[PDB]
Structure formats: C-alpha cells, structure tokens
Design a protein around this ligand. Structure first.
Ligand code: MYR
Ligand code: MYR
Ligand code: MYR
Ligand code: MYR
Ligand code: MYR
Ligand code: MYR
Length: 582
C-alpha cells in the first residue's frame, strides 16, 4: 500500500504496534532511558494514526525502514552516546539500514535485572500495569537486542497473565515465583535456541540445515507429499537465512509470508492448522511453529520396496542424490514422530554412506540388502539411555538423581569448574524429571529438545574458558554427533586427586537458614568437591559419608546451640570421612 506504517498499524492494532515499536527502539538505543523511548513510541504512534486517517498524508508513503532510521538519526545525543552508530546517518537509505544492523551491541554493559520482592512487584503492577510491564519490557529488550521482537511480546503477555492471576491470590509468592522461574527458563531457552539456529547454519551450511528441516517437518506434517515438504523446507531455510541476517521487518515479512502460504494450503499439509490459521497476523506464524504433529496416513507400507529391494536404487540415487536421500529422510521421519530429529539424521547418513559404497561395488543389490540392520543399534542406543536414566530417576527423586549425575560427570571430567558441574548436573536432572514424565512415544523428542539447550549452554561456557579437549571435542563436532560424543565420555584416569581443603568441607548454621535451593547448591557443591578430592571413592563409601553429613546437618540444626555444634560435630564428621575412605 501507499503507506507501510498505516498497514502495519491496522493488522497489528494500536497496543501491539506500540509494544513492538518500543521493543524495536530499545534493542537499538540500549543506552537511552525508558522515558526517551516512551517519547519515541508516542511520536511514531501519533504519526501512524495520521497515515491511517489519510494514506496520502505527509511522509506516510515512506518505507518503515526509512522512518525507523530517520527516527534513529533524530536522537539528539546519538553521537555522544553511540559513536560509530551515528555515522550510519550520513549514508543513503539502502546503505543506512545495513549500517544500523551492524552496530547493535550484543553484550551491553548493564547490571543484571534483579528480581524484586513479590510484594513490591505486585504493588507496582497494581499501581501502573502499563509502565510496570513496558519498563520491564524495555529493560529486557535493551539486554537482548537480537531476541525476536514478537516473541518478546508473546512472553510479556504471559508475564502479564502471571501477575494478574497471582497478585490477588492468597500466597502471592507461592503462586508467582514458580511462574517467574518457568518464564525465565523458557525465555533463556528460546534465546539460546534462536542463536543456535543461526550459528548451526553458519558453521554447517544450507544442506545440513535443510536435512534437519526435512526430518522435522516430515514428522510434523506426515500427510503432506514429499514435494510439498520440500517446498516448505526451501522456504523455511530462506526465512531463517533472512532472519539470521537480523533485519526485523524482513524477518517478520518472510515469516508471515510462509504462514499464509501454509494456511492457504492446509489440505495439502495438515489437518491440525485450523486454529492457528484463524489467529491474527502477529501470532499466526508462531502458532504454526508449535503445532502438534498430525496423524500419519495409517496405510503406510514399508521403506523396503523403494529403498532396498528395488532395482533402480542406485539409478534413482545417482540421478539426484540429495532428492533421493531427502525422500528417504521424509519417509522414515513421517513414520517416526517418536524419534529425535538427530537420530533420523544418523539413519539418513548411514543410508547415504551405504549407497556411496554399494552403488560402486561389484554387486550393489547384495551389498545394501541389509542396510536396515545398521539402523537397529543407532535407534536402540538412545532408547536404552532413556530407559536407564528414567528408571534411575524413578528410584531416586529428582534431587538424589541430580546427585547421581553429579558423581557421574565429575568423575568423567573432574577438571570442569565446580559451579559449572553443579549447574549442568542440576539442569540434566530437570531434563530427567520433565521428559521421563512422558509416555515412551514422546521421550526422545523431549530429550533432544532440552538437551540441545543444556549441552549448548555447557559448551558455551566451556568455549569461553576451555579446560578439557574432550569437552571441546564434543562441543565442536557435528550437532548430530554431539550428544553421543558426550555420552561416550568415561572416567578420567589421568586425574590427580584434588588436595584436601579444610574450609571446603566446613559448614555453618546458616545452612539451616538458606532456601531449599541454595542449601541443595551448597550440598551439591560440597558433593562435587568430595568426589574431586577422593575420585576413586566408591558408591557404597560415598553414601556412608552422605548419610553422616545428612545426620550431622539435622543434628546441628536442631540443637539449642547451632554453630558450636556445626563446629565440633563438624570436625568429627570430617575426620571420620577422611578415614572411611581408606
Ligand atoms: C517480558 C516482560 C516481563 C517483564 C515483567 C517481569 C519482571 C520480572 C523481572 C525479573 C526476571 C527474573 O529474574 O526472573
Ligand atoms: C516502525 C517501527 C517498527 C515496528 C516493527 C514491528 C513490526 C513487527 C511485525 C511482526 C509481525 C510478525 C510476523 C511473524 O512473525 O509471523
Ligand atoms: C526459538 C524459536 C523462536 C522463534 C524464532 C525467531 C526467528 C524465527 C526465524 C525462523 C522462523 C521459522 C521457525 C521454524 O518453524 O523453524
Ligand atoms: C536425561 C534423560 C535421558 C536422555 C536420553 C538422551 C537421548 C537423546 C536423544 C537425542 C539423540 O538422539 O541424541
Ligand atoms: C559435563 C556434562 C557432560 C554430560 C552430558 C551428557 C549428556 C546427557 C546424556 C546422558 C549420558 O549419556 O550420559
Ligand atoms: C571429606 C569430608 C566429607 C564431608 C563433606 C561432604 C559432604 C557431601 C555432601 C552430601 C550432600 C548430599 C545431599 C544430601 O545430603 O541430602
């Protein structure tokens, strides 16, 4: 239309438009205070209303990109505050937009957002919901300048719903703090998952990216024909490519274009899209990305005929290797929503390797007649890890499961930092409690999804402060080999026990006072150090010290003198332990 502002304003609606403009400037003027942004928003919003009344009104025909940069260049202190960013303004439009993109600061130096008291939060929420939510919306977005704006908005609406429900409850903190934790974790995960898409594309290329998409969409839309899955994969890959480049309007337009093609082609795609396809422009593409897997056709044969038994396997393969392999991924994927995408990819690569070797062999048909047998152990490996970890988790609770893991991994990579070991072991543990809750059918997809985040966070930390080549090996390997790489780590026999540190195994009565969280953390911190000082300590020995420590803590927490107790019982416990371990 003549006016991009007016058209966006109309299908977004005033409220969404204003939130979106606020997020958009916050991510670029990360050092301007909230009031300045509220001022920008009001000005852009007034102007937008001008174009809605009259598409022909002044400057209404300019692109949003132009209007956005004009506004940015309008900021008084732009130069004093942002230096080089101000130079973008000297450029003509196409170049200016690309220049602004380059000068977002990724890790802006602001203090951490501290969670205030439930009482002070609810009071603020009550006293002025808008400023309360928009200011925190501003704070978050200036700290996460690459977080997709509409996804940040979808989160903010969930925070809104949390306060609404909890600030008028009964035990506010009881209701609210668990929701805030969930929101925070979820949001951290979505951010890491977004950066992971772009980096994986960069490091591993379009072909790998598309392979991944074939598998996933095939599971999602098993009724769609390969041709339609492959059209979707091509467009999906284009979308991510544009989005990783980082221009928000272009990302949003590409995302919206894909959703409406999908919505216009439901019958060729999935029977599940009705609800998503009736949602407004803003939530449509997001609804589709999360839609339940559709039911598979039911009368599906067996891959043997097309992929093993058929003469023409090598002919069909040679004629279009990636298409053939992609048809193979397709057919296996739609039959197996129960697998993780990465396993499907292992199978595809195994099938590929076999064909490479077999179509150049004396007798191809005999050569690959048994390729399906090679899939068995690949499949069975994650399935057995699930059963073993989930059984253990059913014996031990979550927390004693986290302890099991902590003893497990400290022995494998005892060089890793204690905090990193505690953190990662606690995270792996949640993955357990969560995914083990599902029936067998949804466990691997579950594990894959959350393992990608935990394992990515681990490699991110380790890449910034390397410590074990092995850890670094698993982190840099293909995303398909990553979890198996970590799984294949064993006990570090190279390791020289950490020398005894008295203070490390000293406790005070404040432990009786910490929250449940920080008490676990301090116990688990000590548990790691225990395994670090005595690495060859046995499972039976370890429990004996753990039961003593537990008793120790209970005793000195109940005593008419806690502190004195922690000190004297404390020396007893330690000496007794230093002896129990040979
Ligand atoms: C997105 C918009 C949500 C802003 C309101 C939430 C305020 C909570 C800030 C503390 C976050 C935390 O530490 O978990
Ligand atoms: C002029 C200020 C720029 C404001 C940018 C807000 C527009 C964002 C629209 C996002 C629409 C979502 C599309 C989608 O993800 O499917
Ligand atoms: C982690 C999900 C956050 C939403 C993604 C933000 C940017 C979207 C670009 C690609 C959108 C297509 C998503 C997909 O269906 O794979
Ligand atoms: C923790 C609970 C057990 C997790 C099992 C990990 C299996 C991961 C499947 C993804 C993949 O195929 O590598
Ligand atoms: C240090 C952390 C390395 C352990 C991560 C392993 C990933 C979880 C898979 C379960 C396993 O096979 O051990
Ligand atoms: C050599 C001194 C050993 C005593 C200090 C080690 C304490 C280990 C902490 C055990 C924590 C397990 C969790 C729990 O007790 O519930």
């Amino acid at each position: 239309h003549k006016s991009e502002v007016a058209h966006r304003f109309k299908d977004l609606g005033e409220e969404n438009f204003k939130a979106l403009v606020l997020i958009a400037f916050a991510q670029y003027l990360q050092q301007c205070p909230f009031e300045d942004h509220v001022k920008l928003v009001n000005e852009v919003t007034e102007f937008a209303k001008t174009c809605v009344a009259d598409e022909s009104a002044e400057n209404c025909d300019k692109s949003l990109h132009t209007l956005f940069g004009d506004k940015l260049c309008t900021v008084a202190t732009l130069r004093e505050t942002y230096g080089e960013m101000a130079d973008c303004c000297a450029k003509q439009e196409p170049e200016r937009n690309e220049c602004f993109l380059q000068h977002k600061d990724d890790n802006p130096n602001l203090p951490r957002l501290v969670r205030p008291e439930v009482d002070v939060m609810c009071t603020a929420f009550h006293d002025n919901e808008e400023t309360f939510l928009k200011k925190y919306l501003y704070e978050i977005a200036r700290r996460h300048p690459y977080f997709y704006a509409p996804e940040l908005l979808f989160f903010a609406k969930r925070y809104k719903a949390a306060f609404t429900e909890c600030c008028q409850a009964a035990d506010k903190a009881a209701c609210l703090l668990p929701k805030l934790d969930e929101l925070r974790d979820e949001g951290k995960a979505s951010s890491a998952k977004q950066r992971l898409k772009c980096a994986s594309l960069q490091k591993f290329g379009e072909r790998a990216f598309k392979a991944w998409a074939v598998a996933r969409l095939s599971q999602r839309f098993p009724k769609a024909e390969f041709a339609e899955v492959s059209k979707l994969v091509t467009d999906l890959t284009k979308v991510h490519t544009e989005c990783c480049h980082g221009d928000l309007l272009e990302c949003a337009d590409d995302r919206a274009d894909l959703a409406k093609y999908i919505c216009e082609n439901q019958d060729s795609i999935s029977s599940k899209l009705k609800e998503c396809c009736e949602k407004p422009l803003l939530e449509k593409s997001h609804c589709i990305a999360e839609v339940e897997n559709d039911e598979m056709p039911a009368d599906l044969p067996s891959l043997a005929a097309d992929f093993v038994e058929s003469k023409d396997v090598c002919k069909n393969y040679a004629e279009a290797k990636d298409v053939f392999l992609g048809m193979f991924l397709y057919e296996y994927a739609r039959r197996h929503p129960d697998y993780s995408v990465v396993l499907l990819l292992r199978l595809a690569k195994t099938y590929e390797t076999t064909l490479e070797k077999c179509c150049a062999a004396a007798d191809p048909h005999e050569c690959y007649a048994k390729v399906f047998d090679e899939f068995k152990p690949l499949v069975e490996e994650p399935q057995n890890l699930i059963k073993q970890n989930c059984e253990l988790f059913e014996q031990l609770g979550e927390y004693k499961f986290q302890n099991a893991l902590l003893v497990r991994y400290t022995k494998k990579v005892p060089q890793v930092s204690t905090p990193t070991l505690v953190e990662v072991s606690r995270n792996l543990g949640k993955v357990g409690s969560k995914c083990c809750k599902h029936p067998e059918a949804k466990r691997m997809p579950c594990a894959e999804d959350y393992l990608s985040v935990v394992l990515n966070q681990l490699c991110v930390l380790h890449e910034k402060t390397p410590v074990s080549d092995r850890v670094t090996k698993c982190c840099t390997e293909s995303l398909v080999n990553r979890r198996p790489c970590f799984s294949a780590l064993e006990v570090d026999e190279t390791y020289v026990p950490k020398e005894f540190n008295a203070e490390t195994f000293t406790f005070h009565a404040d432990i009786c006072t910490l929250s449940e969280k920080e008490r676990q953390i301090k116990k688990q911190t000590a548990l790691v150090e225990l395994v670090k000082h005595k690495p060859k300590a046995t499972k039976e020995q370890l429990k004996a010290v753990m039961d003593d420590f537990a008793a120790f803590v209970e005793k000195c927490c109940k005593a008419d003198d806690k502190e004195t107790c922690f000190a004297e019982e404390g020396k007893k416990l330690v000496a007794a332990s230093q002896a129990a371990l040979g």
